C-alpha cells in the first residue's frame, strides 16, 4: 500500500428491512393471497402473429388501484405462470390487510442492472456522517430557532467548525477542499439475490464493505454503534441533539443495523 | 415535417393548474434517456430499410411509454396530445420517421426547460 | 525497443469520468459522462488514467517528511524517467491510449440495456427542513473496455547533457515495480473522481506484455510480468 | 448588427462585481454555428438544400434548450434577439450568414470585456 | 460537428485546485487518403560516384524502411499532447503501384510484401 | 502626424521581462488579411466604398476585438493606439482606409525595428 493510507473494513448486518428511495415506483403487479407475480414485460408481445389486455394498459380512469388488473387477464387463453412466462416475485407476509386510517402500490429499492439490489455507498458514507460529529458533543449544542429557516440550521454552521481542518496556507477551511472527513473511502456494496427486500407497512442479511483511510490532504484516530439507518429510521437518527417544523400540536408539551470496529485486511 | 414548430404549442397544452408546472423534467429521465440509446445506432446502420433485429427494438420504448401512461396521468396526456403512441405504430416501417420522431421528441424538452428555473 | 503491455480492464462500480459541457447533452443530466463521439459509448480518457498514476505516486514513492511534491515537475527522477517534464526535455516512455467501450455486443445479452444509469442521490442539508435532489450519473459495472500501453527505450541516448541516458535491461524492472505500485492503489481507489461515493475500482485481467520491435531477454519479460500480474 | 453587440453588453448583470456568462456556457453553441455556416459558404445555390435547413432547425432546438440553463443565459438570448430572427432563416443563404456574423460579432465581445479581472 | 472539444483538468497538490484545459481532436473514425511516390532514384551525386542508378536490390531494402517506417508509426503517435493517448493510427490498404516507369512484373508484387509486414 | 506618432506608442507599450511581450507572431491573422484588403482597396477606382467591401472593413473589425480579448498584450495595445476609433470613422471612403493600412504598416515596421528579432 502507501504510507499515508491503510485499508479498513466494517460490519453491516441489517435486522430490520432496508429501504432507500430512488424516485422509482411500481404500478398496476398482482396483489393476491399467495403470489406477487413480477413478470417480464418483454414477453407479452410475442403472440402477435396479442391485444388481449395490452390496450387496457393505457386505459385507466376514476377507479381504485388493484381492483380488476389481475382477476381478468388470466381467464383468457393466455397461459400465464412462473417458468413459462418468467419474471420474479417478493411474497406477502402475514397481514392481507384490512386496516383503516388494501395494500396500495409499492416503492422501489435501488438495484444494479438486473434487479439485484445493494445498500448504497453514498448512504453508508452518509451514515457515518451522522456519527462522528454526532457522538462526542457530550454543553451539548442545540438547534435553536422558532421558524423552519432556523430550526435545523445548526447542522450546517457546526459542520464546518471542527470538521474542516486540513489547513493549507492558501485555501479557506470552510469549503470543499480543507475537509478531514475525506480520509476513509467508501466502496459501494455488491448486488444480491432478488427476494432480499420484503413488503413492509412503514432481515438478517450479510453486507460487507471496504473503507480506505487516508492521510494525504490532511496538511489515525478517525476510526474510533447500534444505530438505525437504511429505511424508516425515525425523527432522531439523522443528526445530533423534526416535529416543530411541520404543523403538529404535540410539540409544546424497521432498519436495525450494527457497527463495530473490525481491522481485517 | 415541420413538427419542431408543433412542439412550441403542444407544450402549452400541458394542464398546468397551480400556475406552476406539474410534468417537470425530473419524471422524464426514464423516457428521454432511453430514446437516445436506440437513436445512437439507428444512424449507424447504413441501410435505409431496417433489419428485423431493429424493428423489434423500438417496441420496448413503446411499452415503457404505456407503462408510464398507466403510471402517471401527466404522461397519459403528454402522449395523446403530441401523438407519440400514434406515431409509434408506423415507426416500424422505416427509420426516417424514427429519426423525425426523436427530432420531434428533443424539441419537447426545450420549451419545457425554457419555462423551468433549472438551478443547480 | 518498443514493448507493448496488452491488457483488459473491467469496472465494478459507477464511474463518472469527465463532465464538462456535454457533447450530445440532450438525454443526459447537467453532470454528463464522456463518450465516443462517433458512437456515444462511454470511453476512458488517457489523461486521467495518467492523471491518477502520477498523483497516487506522490505518497508511496515520496512525500516522506512534509514534502508536498507541490507541483508534479518536482517528482523524483524515476517519475521523470517514465512520464517526463520540462525539467529534462525527455519524451516520456509511458505512452497510454484512449480506451472506449468494447462489450456492446455482450452487455445487452447479460440483461443490461441502458448502457449508463442516473443513480439518484441525496444531499441532506439541514437548513429549512429539506433533502436536496441531485442526479449524478453512473456507468454499468458489467462493462469491459480494452487496455494497452507501450514502453519505449531510446538505446542510443534520450538526453543531451550526457551522451548516454539510455536504459539497458537493468532499469526496466524498477519501472515495472513502479508499474506494480503504480496500478496497485488504483485497484482499490477510484479510477475517476468525485470520491467518497463508491467509484471506479477496476480489475486488470490478462495484463501481459508483447515486444513490439527488437530482440529481448527471454527470461526478463516474463519476470517483468510478475509486477504486472500482482496488480 | 455589429453596433448592437456594444449595445447588448449595456444590459447584462454586472452589478455584483463580475460577469455571469462565459464562452464556456455557450461553448456547445459554437461547436454548431461555426460548423454550420462554413457549410453554407460552399453552397453554390442561393436557397438552402434540405440537408441543412434542418441543421439550422437543429440549432433552434439547442438554443432554447441552452436558454433553459441558469439565469446567465436568460438575459443573453433575449437581449440579443437570437431566436426572434432565427426562425426567419429557413429559405435563403444571405442573412443566415449575417445571423452567424452577428453572433460572431457578439461572442467576440460578451466574455471579452475583461474576464481576467472578471470586470 | 467534425471536431470535438475534449476537456482536461489541472490539479496542483498545494491546494487540489481545478484548472481546465481543452484539446480538440479529430473524430476517431476520420479516414484519410494516403499517397506517396517512390522512384528509381537515379543519383545526382556531389560524391564522385557519378550516374549511380539504384537497382531493385537497393529498392527492395527501402520497402522494409517503408515497412518499419510506418510499423512503429502505427504503434507510436502522430500528434501533440504527448504521451496521453492521442494519435493511435492504423495504416490500412497499403499498396505500391508503378505509376510511370519500366518496373518489371516480378518486383512490384514483392515490394507490397513489406507493406503487409507492419 | 499619424506616420510618426506610431513610434512613441511602440515605445509606450512596456516590456519588463527583457523581451517584448507583444510578439510580431501575435498578429499573423490580423495582418494576413489586411494585406488582402489593401490589395483590392487600391484597385478600386471610386472614392466611396464598393458595396461588397464595407462589410470587409467590418469583418476585419471584429477580428481586432476578438484577438484583443484572446490575449492580454493585444488587450491593451489596440485601444492605446486606438484602432477601434480609426475603424469607427472609416466607413465613408478609402480616404481613411489607406491611412489605416499604413498606420498598421507604421506599427509593424516599428515593432520589427525596436526588437532584436532574429530571422
C118 vs C120: CA distance, rounded Å = 6
What is the full DSSP assignment across A62-95? S--SSSSTTTSGGGSS----TTTT--B-----S-
Half-sphere exposure of C194 (CA within 13 A, CB side): 17
F98 vs A220: CA distance, rounded Å = 75
C-beta separation of A256 from A9 below 8 A: no
E28 vs A196: CA distance, rounded Å = 45
C49 vs C147: CA distance, rounded Å = 11
A168 vs A18: CA distance, rounded Å = 40
Of A198, A254, A200, A205, give the one whose Cα is nearest residue A228: A254
C-beta separation of F81 from F107 below 8 A: yes
Q: Are strands C210-213 and C116-117 parallel, antiparallel or unpaired?
A: unpaired
Q: How distant, in Å, are the alpha carbons of A56, C130, C172, E75, E91 from that of E72?
A: 64, 59, 20, 5, 11
In chain A, how long is the greatest CA-to-CA distance? Answer: 76
Residues of A in contact with E16 (CB under 8 A): 177, 217
C95 vs C151: CA distance, rounded Å = 7
Residue C65: all three cell numbers together: 517528511
Q: After which residues is chain B broken (C to N over 2.5 A)?
A: none
C-beta separation of C182 from C83 below 8 A: no
D110 vs F116: CA distance, rounded Å = 37
Report the SS3 class of residue C156.
Answer: coil
Cell 496488480 locates to C231
Interacting residues of C94 by C-beta distance below 8 A, sequence separation 6+: C50, C82, C83, C149, C151, E83
Q: How was this structure determined?
A: cryo-EM
Question: What is the CB neighbour count within 10 angstroms for residue A211?
Answer: 19
Quote the minimal CA–CA distance from B4 to chain D in Å.
8
Of C117, C108, C106, give the one whose Cα is nearest residue C139: C117
Residues of C in contact with B29 (CB under 8 A): 29, 118, 135
- Does residue C114 sit at the B interface (CB-CB below 8 Å)? yes
C-beta separation of C143 from C103 below 8 A: yes
Cis peptide before A97 (omega within 30 of 0): yes
Residue C140: all three cell numbers together: 454499468
Of A191, A212, A209, A202, give the one whose Cα is nearest residue A256: A202
Write down the H helix ranges in C28-165: 48-56, 77-82, 104-107
Quote the minimal CA–CA distance from E48 to chain C in Å.
32
**Cβ contact, residue pair B118, D61, below 8 Å:** no
Question: What is the CB neighbour count within 10 angstroms for residue F46?
Answer: 8
Write the Ramachandran bin of C5: left for phi over 0, alpha for psi from -120 to 50, otherwise beta: beta
Interacting residues of A142 by C-beta distance below 8 A, sequence separation 6+: A154, A241
A52 vs A78: CA distance, rounded Å = 8
F99 vs F83: CA distance, rounded Å = 11
Q: How distant, in Å, are the alpha carbons of B55, C153, C217 from that of C214?
A: 52, 11, 10
Selecting from A3, A125, A148 the residue whose C-beta is nearest the C-beta of C196 gives: A125
C-beta separation of C195 from A5 below 8 A: no
Q: How distant, in Å, are the alpha carbons of A67, E39, E53, E57, E98 from that of E60?
A: 85, 12, 14, 5, 14
Selecting from C26, C40, C114 the residue whose C-beta is nearest the C-beta of B34 gives: C114
Report the SS3 class of residue C5.
Answer: strand
Sign for the pseudo-dihedral over CA of C206, C208, C212, C215: negative
Residues of B in contact with D69 (CB under 8 A): 118
F90 vs D37: CA distance, rounded Å = 28
Cell 463580475 locates to D18
Sign for the pseudo-dihedral over CA of A125, A126, A129, A135: negative
**Cβ contact, residue pair E27, C38, below 8 Å:** yes
A89 vs A197: CA distance, rounded Å = 11
Write down the H helix ranges in D23-109: 27-37, 50-53, 55-66, 71-80, 82-86, 94-107
Interacting residues of F63 by C-beta distance below 8 A, sequence separation 6+: D108, F29, F30, F33
- Chain C residue with CA closest to B43: the answer is C39
Report the SS3 class of residue A14.
Answer: strand
What is the full DSSP assignment across F3-61? SSTHHHHHTTS---SSS-SS-GGGGTTTTTTHHHHHHHHTT--SSB--TTTTTHHHHHH
Residues of E in contact with D27 (CB under 8 A): 5
A152 vs A149: CA distance, rounded Å = 7
Residue B77: all three cell numbers together: 396526456
Residue B50: all three cell numbers together: 431496417
C-beta separation of E8 from C47 below 8 A: yes
B110 vs D16: CA distance, rounded Å = 29
Report the SS3 class of residue A111.
Answer: strand
Cell 494576413 locates to F32
Query: What length is written for chain C?
Result: 231
F97 vs C123: CA distance, rounded Å = 61
C-beta separation of F27 from F111 below 8 A: no
Q: Are strands C94-95 and C2-11 parallel, antiparallel or unpaired?
A: unpaired
Interacting residues of F62 by C-beta distance below 8 A, sequence separation 6+: D2, D104, D105, D108
F94 vs E100: CA distance, rounded Å = 54
Residues of B in contact with C135 (CB under 8 A): 26, 29
Write the Ramachandran bin of C167: left for phi over 0, alpha for psi from -120 to 50, otherwise beta: beta
Q: What is the 3-state secondary structure (H, E, C) of B81-111?
A: HHCHHHHCCHHHCCHHHHHHHHHHHHHHCHH
C-beta separation of C45 from C20 below 8 A: no
C183 vs D49: CA distance, rounded Å = 54
How many D×F Cβ pairs under 8 Å? Answer: 23
Half-sphere exposure of D13 (CA within 13 A, CB side): 10
Of A49, D63, E100, give the one whose Cα is nearest residue B56: A49
A222 vs A240: CA distance, rounded Å = 18
C-beta separation of C128 from A146 below 8 A: no
C-beta separation of F69 from D110 below 8 A: no
Q: Which residues pair with A111 in a beta bridge?
A: A117
Q: Which string of b and e fits C63-81 if b means at least 16 CB within 10 Å? A: beeeeebeebebbeebbbb
DSSP B50: P
D19 vs D4: CA distance, rounded Å = 19
Residue E21: all three cell numbers together: 484545459
Q: Which string of b and e fits A115-150 if b means at least 16 CB within 10 Å? A: eebbbbbbbbbbbbbbeebbeeeeeeeebeeeeeee
C152 — phi, psi (to 5°)?
-130, 140
Report the SS3 class of residue A178.
Answer: coil
Radius of gyration (Cα) for chain D, nearest Å? 15
Cell 449595445 locates to D7
Of C85, C55, C95, C72, give the one whose Cα is nearest residue C191: C55
Q: What is the resolution of this structure in A?
A: 3.7
Amino acid at each position: 500500500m502507501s504510507q499515508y493510507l491503510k485499508p479498513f473494513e466494517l460490519t453491516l448486518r441489517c435486522l430490520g428491512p432496508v429501504f432507500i428511495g430512488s424516485g422509482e415506483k411500481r404500478t398496476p403487479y398482482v396483489a393476491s393471497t399467495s403470489m406477487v407475480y413480477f413478470p417480464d414485460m418483454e414477453r407479452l408481445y410475442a403472440d402477435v402473429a396479442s391485444e388481449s389486455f395490452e390496450e387496457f394498459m393505457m386505459n385507466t380512469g376514476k377507479a381504485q388501484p388493484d381492483e380488476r388488473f389481475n382477476e381478468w387477464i388470466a381467464e383468457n387463453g393466455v397461459k400465464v405462470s412462473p417458468k413459462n412466462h418468467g419474471g420474479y416475485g417478493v411474497k406477502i407476509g402475514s397481514i392481507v390487510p384490512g386496516r383503516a386510517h388494501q395494500l396500495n402500490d409499492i416503492h422501489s429499492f435501488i438495484k444494479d442492472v438486473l434487479g439485484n439490489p445493494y445498500v448504497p455507498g453514498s448512504s453508508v458514507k452518509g451514515m457515518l456522517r451522522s456519527i462522528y460529529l454526532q457522538s462526542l458533543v457530550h454543553q451539548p449544542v442545540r438547534v435553536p430557532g422558532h421558524q423552519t429557516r432556523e430550526h435545523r440550521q445548526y447542522g450546517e454552521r457546526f459542520e464546518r467548525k471542527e470538521l474542516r481542518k486540513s489547513g493549507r496556507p492558501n485555501t479557506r477551511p470552510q469549503d470543499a477542499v480543507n475537509d478531514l472527513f475525506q480520509a476513509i473511502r467508501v466502496t459501494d456494496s455488491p448486488g444480491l439475490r432478488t427476494s432480499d427486500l420484503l413488503i413492509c407497512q412503514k432481515p438478517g442479511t450479510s453486507i460487507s464493505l471496504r473503507v480506505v483511510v487516508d492521510t494525504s490532504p490532511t496538511a489515525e484516530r478517525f476510526l474510533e454503534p447500534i444505530v438505525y439507518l437504511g429505511g424508516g429510521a425515525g425523527y432522531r437518527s439523522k443528526t445530533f441533539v423534526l416535529d416543530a417544523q411541520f404543523p403538529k400540536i404535540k410539540h409544546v408539551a424497521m432498519g436495525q443495523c450494527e457497527l463495530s470496529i473490525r481491522r481485517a485486511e | 415535417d415541420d413538427y419542431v414548430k408543433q412542439a412550441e404549442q403542444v407544450i402549452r397544452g400541458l394542464p398546468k393548474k397551480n400556475g406552476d408546472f406539474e410534468l417537470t423534467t425530473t419524471q422524464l429521465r426514464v423516457l428521454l434517456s432511453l430514446t437516445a440509446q436506440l437513436f445512437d445506432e439507428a444512424q449507424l446502420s447504413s441501410d435505409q430499410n431496417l433489419s428485423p433485429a431493429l424493428r423489434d427494438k423500438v417496441q420496448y420504448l413503446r411499452v415503457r411509454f404505456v407503462y408510464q401512461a398507466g403510471r402517471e396521468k401527466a404522461v397519459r396526456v403528454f402522449v395523446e396530445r403530441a401523438g407519440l403512441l400514434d406515431e409509434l405504430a408506423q415507426i416500424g416501417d422505416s427509420r426516417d420517421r424514427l429519426l423525425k420522431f426523436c427530432h420531434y421528441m428533443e424539441a419537447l424538452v426545450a420549451y419545457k426547460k425554457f419555462l423551468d428555473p433549472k438551478e443547480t | 525497443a518498443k514493448i507493448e503491455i496488452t491488457g483488459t480492464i473491467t469496472v465494478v462500480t459507477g464511474l463518472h469520468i469527465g463532465a464538462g459541457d456535454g457533447f450530445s447533452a440532450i438525454g443526459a443530466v447537467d453532470k454528463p459522462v464522456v463518450r465516443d463521439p462517433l458512437t456515444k459509448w462511454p470511453m476512458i480518457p488517457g489523461t486521467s488514467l495518467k492523471g491518477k498514476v502520477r498523483t497516487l505516486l506522490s505518497r508511496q514513492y515520496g512525500a516522506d517528511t512534509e514534502t508536498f511534491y507541490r507541483k508534479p515537475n518536482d517528482d523524483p527522477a524515476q517519475i521523470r524517467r517514465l512520464f517526463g517534464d520540462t525539467k529534462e526535455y525527455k519524451t516520456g516512455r509511458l505512452v497510454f491510449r484512449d480506451t472506449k467501450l468494447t462489450n456492446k455486443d455482450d452487455l445487452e445479452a447479460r440483461g443490461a440495456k441502458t448502457l449508463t444509469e442516473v443513480k439518484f442521490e441525496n444531499a441532506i442539508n439541514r437548513v429549512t427542513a429539506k433533502a436536496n435532489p441531485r442526479q449524478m450519473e453512473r456507468v454499468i459495472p458489467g462493462s469491459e473496455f480494452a487496455f494497452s500501453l507501450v514502453y519505449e527505450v531510446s538505446f542510443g541516448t534520450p538526453d543531451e547533457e550526457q551522451k548516454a541516458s539510455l536504459p539497458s535491461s537493468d532499469e526496466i524492472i524498477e519501472d515495472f515495480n513502479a508499474i506494480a505500485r503504480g496500478l496497485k492503489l488504483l485497484e482499490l481507489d477510484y479510477l475517476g473522481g468525485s470520491g467518497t461515493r463508491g467509484y471506479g475500482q477496476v480489475k486488470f485481467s490478462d495484463l501481459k506484455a508483447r515486444a513490439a520491435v527488437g530482440t529481448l531477454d527471454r527470461s526478463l519479460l516474463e519476470m517483468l510480468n510478475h509486477e504486472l500480474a500482482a496488480v
